[PDB]
Amino acid sequence: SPVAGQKYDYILVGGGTAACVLANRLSADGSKRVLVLEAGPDNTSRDVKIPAAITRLFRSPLDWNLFSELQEQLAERQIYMARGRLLGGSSATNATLYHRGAAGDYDAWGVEGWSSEDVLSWFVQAETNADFGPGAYHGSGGPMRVENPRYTNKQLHTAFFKAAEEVGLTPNSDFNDWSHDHAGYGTFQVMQDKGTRADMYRQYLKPVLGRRNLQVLTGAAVTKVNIDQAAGKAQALGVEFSTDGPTGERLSAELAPGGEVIMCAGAVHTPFLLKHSGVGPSAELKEFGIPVVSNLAGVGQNLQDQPACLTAAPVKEKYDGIAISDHIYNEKGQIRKRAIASYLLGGRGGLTSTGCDRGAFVRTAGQALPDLQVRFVPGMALDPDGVSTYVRFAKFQSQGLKWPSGITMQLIACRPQSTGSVGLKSADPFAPPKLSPGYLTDKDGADLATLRKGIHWARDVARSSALSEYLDGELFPGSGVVSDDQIDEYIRRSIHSSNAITGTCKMGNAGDSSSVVDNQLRVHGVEGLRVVDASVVPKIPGGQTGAPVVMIAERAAALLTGKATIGASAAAP
Ligand SMILES: Cc1cc2nc3c(=O)[nH]c(=O)nc-3n(C[C@H](O)[C@H](O)[C@H](O)COP(=O)(O)OP(=O)(O)OC[C@H]3O[C@@H](n4cnc5c(N)ncnc54)[C@H](O)[C@@H]3O)c2cc1C
Ligand SMILES: CCCCCCCCCCCCCCCCCC(=O)O
Ligand SMILES: CCCCCCCCCCCCCCCCCC(=O)O
């Protein structure tokens, strides 16, 4: 209906992080008609603009409210896996931490034309940094905004840093500078613009909505990619979607000649939609009577996510009032006047904080790269599940209760060895995917050992003089949890997502049989079909995954507009 009689040069499935970048770059020269189909609504929520309101986005209407299959290995629990559902996607609902990982993470992909030396200029191009000028590792005029956090907990941030120094960890002045080792303690930069969320809707899509060659539909749930097995090769024709949920008429947006469909539905929904389109393991598609168009083993495999557990400790009675929970709420759960004023006057104070923007990368045992990320929070978890405690914190407002003053250290396996999957539980394209995070399933128990040693590291830091000055015992995991076996069980019962999720449409070299796309991001076995989102990441980098997604989208846009090629190698004689 809004696409009737229209031909598009690019159809983007999803309007999330990658999609906002592509919509911007691909519509730039005015020659090409670009359609964006987002299932969620427009990006207008105040809860998206205010970083501390991440607490309100979990388990909300702007989230997919996805739960995993029962995990036998995690005390037989379903795991919540937060995913943004609106223009800007998960960039609109995330913790805003700005990480690229290490040069070694990209070289470890071993994909031609995607080495650390290939990707660096694409990170730098995207970047405007308020605290790092132009140099080998920072750009200055890109659409992203990155800055040092504009909240500082004067006692607790300083005490964390001195405690990490007291246990002998080195500082890292810039976690995105590849001229030095990834490990160390310091401050995570944030995708914020003077303390307001700088999501990829705000930075890439919203500024160009005036473009007549760009059409963005919200409330538009893609149901499958339309693919024709005519001439003698599967050819994308366009995309089926409903603007009215499961009962809506199935509409078809149509490609112009030379048109491509680009999957931008993210590492959960892209492989889900490809399988509904006949692209996936033939046995899984047959299960639900989906005709096999491209028998591709890798689709929905290689799901990598960074699992988390935490410690938490209260402060002494005399340090009551010093935590971020005290900066945001008073003792009745009323939002502090000082926090509102600081946010509106100059974009500072507790409302600019996602809480978890100071920390460390640590090697638990002589690894080539750090296996542990620590996120320090100058406030106290009231649940061993940190995402649950954030939902609790949002619900706490106006309850007339006082949130106890304390700290948390979240431990993340940032370069995990476990993999999971995403597939189908039904033929209905509106049903939730069959989602398996696969936490703690690696053959050697490496991810569990990372988190157990993480808890020992957090206890060493909390015991050090600088922090123990403020603290008064331990709430989580608590004095009941001391042996290696007790810690493992605490981890199984409390492990939660740190919200990465990559690798379900793995990019790979020619000859790599686990790959779903080539190094041009083309889906194997289909013409005019690409994936440009977190799905394509072969091997997850350490740290949060948003900045690598924007880098991949920037480079794909350059490839599709003819501004760049990918690979590299001189022809053999
Ligand atoms: C709570 C949370 C915290 C995070 N913390 C951080 C952090 O601090 N820093 C960081 O860098 N990274 C963080 N991440 C990860 C980062 O946000 C993601 O890796 C990145 O945003 C993913 O980009 P994407 O384009 O691949 O997918 P998304 O941004 O998820 O975009 C996918 C889009 O597709 C849409 N979609 C799905 N199905 C359909 C359909 N059938 N039809 C139409 N549209 C559909 C979705 O609604 C969504 O808008 C976090 C993630 C979350 C969820
Ligand atoms: C954890 C609780 C998070 C609280 C966040 C909501 C705080 C509400 C403050 C009152 C609204 C402030 C004025 C509106 C600011 C609108 C967002 C913006 O335009 O940047
Ligand atoms: C925004 C400030 C809220 C304060 C809440 C109290 C402190 C709790 C720390 C929670 C445990 C670790 C952080 C969990 C981070 C969840 C966000 C994310 O993963 O994207």
XYZ file of C-alpha atoms and ligand atoms in Angstrom:
666
model
C 0.000 0.000 0.000
C 2.710 2.617 0.935
C 4.994 0.686 -1.529
C 2.325 0.004 -4.273
C 3.727 0.838 -7.750
C 7.188 1.583 -6.199
C 10.579 0.136 -7.291
C 13.519 0.325 -4.757
C 17.304 0.095 -5.436
C 17.840 -1.000 -1.763
C 15.381 -2.578 0.706
C 16.707 -2.660 4.319
C 15.090 -5.328 6.564
C 15.102 -3.650 9.991
C 15.711 -0.015 10.913
C 18.301 -0.652 13.656
C 21.948 0.304 14.211
C 23.396 -0.890 10.828
C 20.221 0.055 8.910
C 20.387 3.746 10.030
C 23.997 4.016 8.767
C 23.139 2.320 5.398
C 19.924 4.394 4.874
C 22.110 7.519 5.316
C 25.056 6.497 3.056
C 22.980 4.751 0.320
C 20.469 7.680 -0.105
C 23.303 10.331 -0.001
C 23.827 10.944 -3.803
C 20.002 11.090 -4.593
C 20.312 8.527 -7.462
C 19.016 5.439 -5.513
C 15.585 4.763 -3.957
C 16.032 3.282 -0.395
C 13.242 1.670 1.668
C 13.626 0.970 5.449
C 11.196 -1.469 7.084
C 11.242 -1.370 10.925
C 8.863 -3.550 13.032
C 9.098 -1.133 16.015
C 7.865 2.473 16.220
C 9.511 5.820 15.607
C 12.295 6.892 18.015
C 10.578 9.615 20.134
C 10.676 8.201 23.744
C 12.242 10.364 26.496
C 13.412 6.997 28.001
C 15.665 6.616 24.894
C 17.172 10.160 25.155
C 18.146 9.929 28.902
C 21.015 7.409 29.411
C 19.969 6.447 32.984
C 16.487 5.551 31.594
C 18.097 2.423 30.045
C 16.689 1.026 33.364
C 13.137 1.664 31.907
C 13.804 0.174 28.425
C 14.478 -3.409 29.629
C 11.243 -5.518 29.560
C 9.322 -2.519 28.001
C 7.275 -2.061 24.794
C 10.526 -0.785 23.099
C 12.162 -4.229 23.744
C 11.533 -7.571 21.938
C 11.014 -9.283 25.392
C 12.913 -12.350 24.077
C 13.523 -15.364 26.412
C 15.853 -18.271 25.545
C 14.852 -21.914 25.524
C 15.266 -23.555 28.958
C 19.047 -23.864 29.590
C 19.654 -27.199 31.456
C 23.293 -26.042 32.153
C 22.095 -22.758 33.865
C 19.924 -24.312 36.628
C 17.158 -25.045 34.024
C 16.381 -21.323 33.457
C 15.151 -19.250 30.535
C 17.522 -16.283 29.972
C 16.114 -12.845 29.063
C 17.982 -11.411 26.057
C 17.187 -7.655 25.704
C 16.914 -6.412 22.050
C 15.815 -2.904 20.923
C 12.581 -2.632 18.891
C 12.312 0.836 17.242
C 14.210 3.046 14.754
C 17.884 2.922 15.895
C 17.318 -0.678 17.135
C 19.612 -1.735 19.995
C 21.690 1.494 19.573
C 18.550 3.244 21.048
C 18.353 0.837 24.090
C 22.024 -0.006 24.892
C 24.514 1.000 27.618
C 26.259 3.388 25.111
C 29.779 1.958 25.893
C 32.182 2.661 22.960
C 34.517 -0.359 22.336
C 36.295 -1.703 19.235
C 38.183 -4.496 21.076
C 41.816 -5.175 20.025
C 43.616 -5.339 16.613
C 44.062 -9.097 17.357
C 40.249 -9.623 17.416
C 39.955 -8.617 13.688
C 43.146 -10.435 12.598
C 41.702 -13.516 14.402
C 38.739 -13.370 11.911
C 41.345 -14.338 9.263
C 38.930 -13.025 6.566
C 40.578 -11.522 3.466
C 40.137 -7.703 3.332
C 38.940 -7.525 7.019
C 42.270 -7.482 8.945
C 42.826 -4.983 11.797
C 44.696 -2.816 9.215
C 41.631 -3.013 6.831
C 38.969 -1.984 9.417
C 40.816 0.803 11.340
C 40.085 3.653 8.845
C 36.369 2.631 8.891
C 36.170 3.035 12.723
C 37.989 6.396 12.397
C 35.715 7.650 9.588
C 32.553 7.089 11.723
C 33.973 8.973 14.721
C 33.645 12.434 16.309
C 35.302 12.255 19.752
C 34.885 14.999 22.384
C 38.003 13.853 24.386
C 40.457 12.452 21.753
C 41.590 14.565 18.835
C 42.479 13.177 15.414
C 45.307 10.626 15.500
C 46.195 7.069 14.427
C 43.082 5.717 16.324
C 40.544 8.591 16.404
C 38.668 10.569 13.725
C 37.006 13.985 14.153
C 34.143 14.587 11.694
C 32.093 11.358 11.569
C 28.375 11.200 12.485
C 28.901 9.174 15.698
C 29.365 11.199 18.890
C 31.719 9.657 21.487
C 32.760 11.311 24.764
C 34.032 10.610 28.271
C 31.062 10.070 30.600
C 29.652 13.379 32.044
C 28.825 11.714 35.388
C 31.688 11.000 37.839
C 31.214 9.440 41.282
C 33.963 11.413 43.076
C 34.555 8.874 45.914
C 33.646 5.502 44.286
C 35.178 5.868 40.768
C 38.507 7.080 42.282
C 38.422 4.214 44.882
C 37.816 1.594 42.118
C 40.860 2.931 40.145
C 43.142 3.015 43.219
C 41.907 -0.521 44.210
C 42.737 -1.895 40.712
C 46.222 -0.223 41.029
C 46.599 -1.764 44.553
C 46.002 -5.324 43.104
C 48.653 -4.540 40.411
C 46.504 -3.971 37.263
C 47.963 -1.397 34.807
C 45.843 1.560 33.604
C 44.600 1.738 29.990
C 44.127 5.404 28.984
C 42.285 4.432 25.778
C 40.690 0.976 25.275
C 40.411 1.791 21.474
C 44.114 2.623 20.946
C 45.628 -0.442 19.209
C 49.253 0.753 19.817
C 49.044 -0.759 23.318
C 47.685 -3.912 25.011
C 43.881 -4.153 25.645
C 44.217 -5.087 29.355
C 43.991 -2.504 32.166
C 41.544 -0.363 34.182
C 40.034 2.977 33.161
C 36.989 4.803 31.825
C 34.813 3.530 29.002
C 33.861 6.260 26.531
C 30.130 6.524 25.676
C 28.013 7.080 22.501
C 26.459 10.231 24.014
C 26.367 13.892 22.932
C 26.740 16.105 26.052
C 25.009 13.428 28.164
C 22.120 12.636 25.755
C 21.994 9.209 24.017
C 23.682 9.456 20.573
C 22.015 6.402 18.948
C 22.366 5.767 15.194
C 18.776 6.995 14.533
C 19.773 10.374 16.074
C 23.237 10.473 14.395
C 22.625 8.890 10.911
C 18.910 8.500 9.994
C 17.050 11.461 11.591
C 19.241 14.147 9.911
C 18.401 12.792 6.357
C 14.646 11.886 6.634
C 13.958 14.906 4.313
C 15.595 12.987 1.380
C 12.894 12.261 -1.258
C 14.742 9.037 -2.348
C 14.473 7.641 1.276
C 11.243 5.985 2.596
C 11.157 4.747 6.239
C 8.194 2.645 7.435
C 7.754 1.862 11.162
C 5.196 -0.735 12.412
C 6.387 -2.793 9.382
C 7.152 -6.414 10.381
C 9.060 -8.185 7.586
C 7.745 -11.813 7.166
C 10.303 -13.036 4.539
C 12.537 -12.051 1.614
C 10.831 -12.854 -1.762
C 13.293 -14.985 -3.825
C 12.781 -16.266 -7.441
C 14.456 -19.559 -8.620
C 13.881 -18.633 -12.355
C 16.872 -18.000 -14.786
C 19.196 -20.557 -13.037
C 20.164 -18.951 -9.673
C 18.042 -17.761 -6.674
C 17.401 -13.998 -7.098
C 15.949 -11.671 -4.414
C 12.791 -9.872 -5.777
C 12.066 -7.861 -2.595
C 10.376 -8.280 0.752
C 7.024 -9.295 2.230
C 5.807 -7.430 5.350
C 2.683 -6.587 7.412
C 1.926 -3.004 8.587
C -0.778 -4.474 10.953
C 0.791 -7.374 12.880
C -0.026 -11.060 12.307
C -3.567 -10.377 10.889
C -2.369 -7.662 8.443
C -2.403 -8.102 4.667
C 0.999 -9.416 3.443
C 2.414 -6.560 1.284
C 5.423 -6.918 -1.097
C 8.000 -4.184 -1.634
C 9.670 -4.737 -5.042
C 13.279 -4.256 -6.200
C 14.118 -2.233 -9.300
C 16.562 -3.980 -11.679
C 20.014 -4.316 -10.014
C 18.236 -3.827 -6.613
C 19.494 -5.591 -3.449
C 17.754 -6.607 -0.207
C 20.058 -5.923 2.812
C 19.340 -7.825 6.052
C 19.667 -5.378 9.028
C 17.400 -7.224 11.540
C 20.415 -8.033 13.787
C 22.038 -11.251 15.037
C 18.708 -12.591 16.489
C 16.140 -11.689 13.760
C 18.278 -11.723 10.522
C 19.024 -15.515 10.623
C 15.375 -16.048 11.783
C 14.069 -14.144 8.735
C 16.580 -15.851 6.329
C 15.255 -19.297 7.473
C 11.611 -18.085 6.920
C 12.856 -17.048 3.410
C 14.276 -20.544 2.579
C 17.947 -19.653 3.435
C 19.242 -22.006 6.123
C 19.863 -25.624 7.133
C 17.510 -27.695 4.886
C 16.456 -29.961 7.835
C 15.325 -26.909 9.935
C 13.348 -25.403 6.996
C 11.693 -28.822 6.122
C 10.622 -29.125 9.808
C 8.153 -26.193 9.126
C 7.473 -26.878 5.432
C 9.653 -23.936 4.246
C 10.920 -24.579 0.669
C 14.787 -24.745 0.637
C 16.175 -21.930 -1.587
C 19.789 -21.954 -0.271
C 20.841 -24.958 1.855
C 23.270 -23.066 4.175
C 24.449 -24.921 7.294
C 25.757 -21.777 9.079
C 22.531 -19.712 9.328
C 21.691 -19.203 13.043
C 24.868 -21.083 14.151
C 27.916 -19.460 15.844
C 25.743 -17.226 18.144
C 28.331 -15.515 20.397
C 27.187 -13.568 23.462
C 29.221 -12.288 26.445
C 27.781 -13.773 29.684
C 27.875 -11.785 32.994
C 27.729 -12.403 36.755
C 28.301 -9.843 39.541
C 29.476 -9.050 43.062
C 27.894 -6.268 45.128
C 28.846 -4.695 48.471
C 27.180 -2.046 50.692
C 29.147 1.049 51.907
C 29.675 1.779 55.624
C 26.848 3.716 57.360
C 29.033 6.917 57.292
C 29.157 6.742 53.420
C 25.334 6.470 53.118
C 24.312 8.888 50.291
C 27.464 8.636 48.070
C 26.220 6.106 45.424
C 24.723 6.820 41.970
C 21.371 5.436 43.338
C 21.489 8.361 45.858
C 22.346 10.847 43.022
C 19.268 9.734 40.978
C 16.681 9.066 43.741
C 16.035 10.483 47.206
C 15.064 8.166 50.162
C 11.391 8.092 48.894
C 12.294 7.095 45.273
C 11.700 10.634 44.000
C 14.029 11.681 41.107
C 16.515 14.201 42.565
C 16.063 17.897 41.660
C 19.915 18.249 41.367
C 20.044 15.347 38.791
C 17.220 16.873 36.650
C 18.834 20.360 36.784
C 22.382 19.046 35.960
C 20.988 17.041 33.008
C 18.920 19.949 31.546
C 21.415 22.798 32.408
C 24.652 21.271 31.006
C 24.118 17.526 30.294
C 25.928 16.351 33.458
C 25.186 14.232 36.561
C 23.564 10.881 37.332
C 20.918 10.952 34.556
C 23.755 10.955 31.892
C 25.003 7.590 33.302
C 24.176 4.024 32.169
C 26.057 3.063 35.398
C 28.559 0.535 33.960
C 31.031 2.864 32.115
C 34.161 2.364 34.322
C 36.029 -0.939 34.465
C 38.829 -3.115 33.174
C 39.891 -5.830 30.797
C 41.807 -8.617 32.577
C 43.638 -11.846 31.566
C 42.495 -14.467 34.156
C 45.297 -16.897 33.080
C 47.938 -15.876 30.487
C 45.588 -15.688 27.422
C 46.781 -13.891 24.233
C 43.937 -11.342 24.874
C 41.910 -10.494 28.014
C 39.112 -13.043 28.678
C 37.415 -10.882 31.383
C 35.756 -7.465 31.144
C 34.896 -5.799 34.505
C 32.150 -3.178 34.671
C 32.280 -1.180 37.944
C 29.022 0.538 38.988
C 29.038 3.055 41.879
C 25.681 1.635 43.034
C 24.568 -1.617 44.636
C 22.764 -4.490 42.838
C 19.756 -5.813 44.829
C 19.644 -8.922 42.577
C 22.506 -11.184 41.410
C 21.065 -10.691 37.864
C 22.227 -7.145 36.877
C 19.599 -6.693 34.107
C 16.844 -7.700 36.667
C 18.284 -5.160 39.153
C 18.102 -2.408 36.433
C 14.341 -3.291 35.898
C 13.948 -3.186 39.716
C 15.653 0.258 39.732
C 13.218 1.675 37.103
C 10.216 0.185 39.076
C 11.669 1.634 42.351
C 10.619 5.232 41.487
C 7.956 6.734 43.834
C 7.772 3.560 45.995
C 8.769 5.656 49.107
C 11.727 3.244 49.764
C 15.492 3.967 50.155
C 17.858 2.023 47.796
C 20.868 0.999 49.930
C 24.201 2.760 49.060
C 26.919 0.443 47.655
C 28.915 -0.809 44.628
C 28.705 -3.597 42.059
C 31.329 -5.259 39.891
C 29.938 -7.045 36.825
C 32.195 -9.803 35.386
C 31.845 -10.563 31.677
C 33.472 -13.309 29.584
C 34.298 -10.840 26.749
C 36.020 -13.315 24.305
C 33.846 -16.353 25.060
C 34.526 -19.917 23.772
C 30.816 -21.031 24.031
C 28.398 -20.711 21.056
C 24.602 -20.931 20.837
C 22.024 -20.754 18.064
C 18.866 -19.103 16.817
C 16.270 -21.041 14.787
C 12.491 -21.638 14.466
C 9.931 -23.011 17.030
C 7.053 -22.612 14.478
C 6.133 -21.727 10.847
C 4.689 -18.393 12.077
C 7.053 -15.515 11.127
C 5.532 -13.396 13.990
C 6.445 -15.988 16.656
C 9.544 -15.485 18.838
C 12.686 -17.241 17.539
C 14.029 -20.418 19.135
C 16.887 -18.759 20.979
C 19.769 -20.600 22.665
C 22.586 -18.403 24.145
C 24.743 -21.530 24.862
C 26.427 -19.929 27.906
C 29.016 -22.138 29.675
C 28.831 -24.974 27.073
C 32.457 -24.785 25.768
C 34.185 -28.224 26.008
C 36.930 -27.053 28.463
C 34.693 -25.058 30.895
C 36.760 -21.935 29.918
C 33.811 -19.421 30.123
C 32.819 -20.687 33.626
C 36.514 -20.500 34.724
C 36.667 -16.872 33.364
C 33.600 -15.859 35.452
C 34.767 -17.797 38.580
C 38.216 -16.105 38.406
C 36.365 -12.812 37.715
C 34.534 -13.193 41.044
C 37.923 -13.871 42.766
C 39.324 -10.707 40.989
C 36.312 -8.555 42.162
C 36.737 -9.877 45.735
C 40.503 -8.954 45.651
C 39.634 -5.418 44.461
C 36.835 -4.982 47.051
C 39.257 -6.144 49.797
C 42.030 -3.681 48.759
C 42.556 -0.673 51.128
C 41.286 1.975 48.656
C 37.792 0.389 48.246
C 37.541 -1.367 51.650
C 37.694 2.193 53.086
C 34.070 2.568 51.811
C 32.641 -0.960 52.035
C 31.002 -2.912 54.852
C 30.955 -6.625 53.845
C 29.484 -8.285 50.708
C 25.842 -8.773 49.598
C 26.476 -10.882 46.411
C 27.491 -13.582 46.097
C 27.830 -13.357 49.900
C 29.686 -15.161 52.731
C 27.788 -18.424 51.904
C 29.611 -18.613 48.500
C 33.362 -19.385 48.914
C 34.450 -22.720 47.349
C 34.945 -23.065 43.566
C 31.802 -25.318 43.475
C 29.645 -22.751 45.390
C 30.828 -19.936 43.008
C 30.079 -22.081 39.885
C 26.553 -22.760 41.201
C 26.037 -19.012 41.997
C 27.176 -18.313 38.385
C 24.773 -20.967 36.902
C 21.793 -19.479 38.878
C 22.524 -15.716 38.199
C 24.372 -15.607 34.806
C 22.781 -12.995 32.524
C 23.484 -11.335 29.145
C 25.831 -8.312 28.791
C 23.916 -7.851 25.500
C 26.398 -8.525 22.659
C 24.954 -11.272 20.349
C 26.952 -11.688 17.103
C 27.964 -14.177 14.466
C 24.708 -15.949 13.296
C 25.352 -15.096 9.557
C 29.138 -15.557 9.814
C 31.238 -13.772 7.178
C 33.967 -16.132 5.845
C 36.743 -16.637 3.308
C 36.182 -18.699 0.179
C 36.680 -22.280 1.430
C 35.156 -21.575 4.885
C 32.121 -23.949 4.934
C 30.648 -22.421 8.174
C 30.159 -19.062 6.431
C 26.774 -17.532 5.489
C 28.154 -14.459 3.650
C 31.358 -13.831 1.665
C 33.772 -10.912 2.365
C 31.414 -8.720 0.252
C 28.587 -9.601 2.790
C 26.602 -11.445 0.029
C 24.463 -14.414 1.154
C 25.760 -17.683 -0.438
C 23.335 -19.148 -3.035
C 21.237 -15.953 -3.520
C 21.758 -12.923 -5.801
C 20.874 -9.372 -4.617
C 20.805 -10.442 -0.911
C 23.351 -9.205 1.688
C 23.621 -9.115 5.469
C 24.916 -5.894 7.126
C 24.534 -6.142 10.932
C 26.120 -7.937 13.939
C 25.172 -11.373 12.351
C 28.232 -11.188 10.041
C 30.874 -10.876 12.826
C 33.000 -14.062 12.446
C 34.522 -13.937 15.971
C 33.220 -11.535 18.628
C 35.669 -8.771 19.647
C 36.230 -8.028 23.323
C 34.007 -5.246 24.631
C 30.519 -4.076 23.627
C 29.595 -4.772 19.941
C 27.846 -1.553 18.705
C 30.915 0.353 17.377
C 32.041 -2.719 15.252
C 28.464 -2.922 13.814
C 28.622 0.780 12.693
C 32.144 0.151 11.209
C 30.784 -2.850 9.210
C 27.760 -0.762 8.006
C 30.042 2.190 7.010
C 32.332 -0.151 5.034
C 29.434 -2.033 3.369
C 27.872 1.347 2.292
C 31.275 2.377 0.771
C 31.401 -1.010 -1.096
C 27.781 -0.753 -2.355
C 28.198 2.938 -3.542
C 31.523 2.037 -5.297
C 33.631 4.309 -3.038
C 35.655 1.235 -1.887
C 36.519 -2.399 -2.720
C 37.097 -5.222 -0.173
C 40.158 -7.419 -0.842
C 43.075 -6.485 -1.639
C 45.262 -9.333 -2.987
C 47.143 -8.936 -6.321
C 46.146 -11.608 -8.914
C 48.652 -14.553 -9.047
C 50.758 -14.597 -12.296
C 20.437 -3.662 26.372
C 21.638 -3.657 25.459
C 22.833 -3.130 25.904
C 23.941 -2.989 25.038
N 25.058 -2.328 25.484
C 25.906 -1.925 24.555
C 26.933 -0.969 24.868
O 27.005 -0.373 25.934
N 27.687 -0.520 23.823
C 27.589 -1.064 22.534
O 28.399 -0.717 21.693
N 26.812 -2.123 22.299
C 25.923 -2.442 23.208
N 24.985 -3.366 22.902
C 25.081 -4.059 21.606
C 24.740 -3.165 20.447
O 23.617 -2.289 20.848
C 24.409 -4.095 19.276
O 25.482 -5.059 18.993
C 24.066 -3.354 17.988
O 23.273 -2.205 18.284
C 23.348 -4.282 17.033
O 23.107 -3.592 15.785
P 22.304 -4.322 14.613
O 22.028 -3.329 13.546
O 23.026 -5.596 14.276
O 20.897 -4.750 15.258
P 19.771 -3.875 16.003
O 20.297 -2.515 16.348
O 19.209 -4.751 17.076
O 18.754 -3.660 14.782
C 17.829 -4.710 14.378
C 16.501 -4.079 14.053
O 15.700 -5.010 13.282
C 14.362 -4.879 13.705
N 13.603 -6.064 13.314
C 13.665 -7.326 13.849
N 12.823 -8.160 13.278
C 12.197 -7.411 12.294
C 11.215 -7.739 11.335
N 10.639 -8.947 11.252
N 10.814 -6.740 10.502
C 11.368 -5.518 10.631
N 12.294 -5.100 11.496
C 12.666 -6.113 12.310
C 14.459 -4.650 15.209
O 13.280 -4.088 15.743
C 15.656 -3.698 15.284
O 15.253 -2.344 15.248
C 23.867 -3.513 23.732
C 22.687 -4.150 23.327
C 21.525 -4.071 24.111
C 20.251 -4.695 23.594
C 16.452 5.346 36.413
C 15.400 6.375 36.343
C 15.680 7.144 35.079
C 14.941 8.447 35.208
C 14.894 9.100 33.878
C 13.758 10.046 33.829
C 14.178 11.326 34.486
C 13.043 12.270 34.229
C 13.566 13.655 34.408
C 12.388 14.539 34.107
C 12.430 14.803 32.627
C 13.625 15.680 32.347
C 13.180 16.659 31.309
C 13.016 15.930 30.007
C 14.349 15.562 29.358
C 13.922 14.992 28.019
C 14.993 14.163 27.343
C 15.796 15.062 26.493
O 15.186 15.892 25.779
O 17.027 14.933 26.535
C 21.767 3.705 35.797
C 22.168 3.496 37.266
C 21.321 2.486 37.985
C 21.883 1.912 39.267
C 21.461 0.455 39.517
C 22.269 -0.138 40.699
C 23.619 -0.815 40.452
C 23.474 -2.175 39.822
C 24.609 -2.629 38.882
C 23.946 -3.744 38.150
C 24.842 -4.822 37.818
C 25.706 -4.566 36.657
C 25.243 -3.674 35.574
C 24.171 -4.344 34.755
C 24.176 -3.501 33.484
C 22.913 -3.721 32.676
C 23.027 -2.908 31.405
C 23.563 -3.661 30.218
O 24.082 -4.767 30.349
O 23.429 -3.161 29.066
